[PDB]
């Protein structure tokens, strides 16, 4: 746990923290958080969505979705709790619990999640357990806005599952049967809008079992955390167009984009137009200085791994590890 996030989860209801299933869902640095709209898929008893809740401040929303009866039954009995604990008052909450499946978001109860209208969604482990990957990642994109990001964590491979480990139950369970080959998921977010994928963190995830073990049996598993902005002018590729990119500071004395990307407080740093256009359209503007596009000058080179920031997922993930 970051120890920002320590005295504020302290403040959280004991019952929520006590019936909370799961690995928290990871956030964006807490800075860039101020008034955002935040989505959890797979939200649980709350934990995640009201630590969002104190991080996004009152002029931020926070929007929990599951579809346990039972976990939401207790996060929305503790939202009046949570207003006063963090605003005030019983009446000044910024959250609401939406009971639905997380594939289908415009369907959820009391009300749908519109078109266009979340800045950031998190998750932890949904993916793999998900009954249309697709279908999910489509709904993600329809309700992020232009800028908005989807910053989550979930398990991948190395290869492709055989189909005998696509249908065990305990490794279908424990989120590694159902999970994807990197470069499939690379591919199917594409097709669902998300032109560029970037790693953040990686961890390894380890079968020990040696039954479970000898139906994937050299297949190396991650956890993995990406973000995946929604913007309109991103390409496939990182193209270089002269841009440098300066963080004005205001949210930490640096800001770490992703693995290929950190940008100190007023040093300019080279960037591909792709990450120009992320700081640029995104709520990331607010603490940054962008130069403009000069004439495109061919693949972006100015970055001490950029064989690696062109490789594929797979290869960048497991230099990451190594
Ligand atoms: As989803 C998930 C991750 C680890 C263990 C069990 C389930
Ligand atoms: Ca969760």
Redesign the pocket.
């Known amino acids: 746990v970051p120890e920002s996030h320590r005295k504020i989860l302290a403040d959280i209801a004991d019952e929520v923290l006590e019936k909370f299933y799961?690995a928290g869902?990871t956030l964006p640095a807490d800075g860039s958080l101020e008034g955002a709209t935040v989505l959890?898929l797979?939200?649980?008893t709350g934990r995640?969505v009201y630590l969002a809740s104190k991080l996004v401040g009152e002029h931020g929303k926070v929007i929990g979705v599951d579809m346990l009866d039972n976990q939401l039954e207790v996060a929305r009995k503790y939202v009046e709790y949570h207003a006063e604990k963090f605003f005030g008052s019983p009446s000044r909450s910024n959250v609401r619990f939406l009971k639905g499946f997380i594939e289908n978001l415009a369907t959820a109860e009391p009300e749908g999640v519109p078109d266009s209208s979340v800045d950031i969604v998190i998750?932890?482990c949904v993916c793999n357990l998900s009954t249309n990957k697709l279908a999910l990642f489509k709904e993600i994109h329809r309700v992020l806005r232009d800028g908005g990001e989807l910053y989550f964590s979930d398990v991948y491979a190395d290869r492709r599952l055989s189909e005998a480990a696509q249908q065990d139950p305990i490794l279908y369970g424990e989120c590694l049967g159902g999970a994807l080959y990197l470069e499939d998921f690379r591919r199917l977010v594409a097709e669902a809008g998300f032109r560029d994928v970037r790693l953040v963190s990686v961890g390894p995830v380890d079968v020990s079992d040696p039954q479970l073990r000898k139906l994937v049996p050299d297949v190396q598993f991650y956890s993995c955390t990406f973000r995946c902005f929604k913007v309109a002018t991103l390409e496939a590729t990182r193209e270089d167009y002269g841009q440098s990119a300066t963080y004005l500071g205001g949210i930490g004395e640096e800001f770490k984009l992703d693995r290929f990307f950190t940008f100190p407080r007023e040093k300019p740093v080279r960037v591909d137009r792709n990450t120009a256009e992320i700081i640029r359209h995104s709520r990331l503007h607010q603490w940054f200085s962008v130069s403009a596009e000069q004439q495109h000058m061919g693949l972006f080179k100015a970055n001490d791994s950029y064989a690696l920031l062109h490789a594929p997922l797979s290869m960048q993930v497991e230099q990451l590890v190594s």
């Open positions: 799961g869902s959890d797979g939200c649980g995640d998750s932890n």
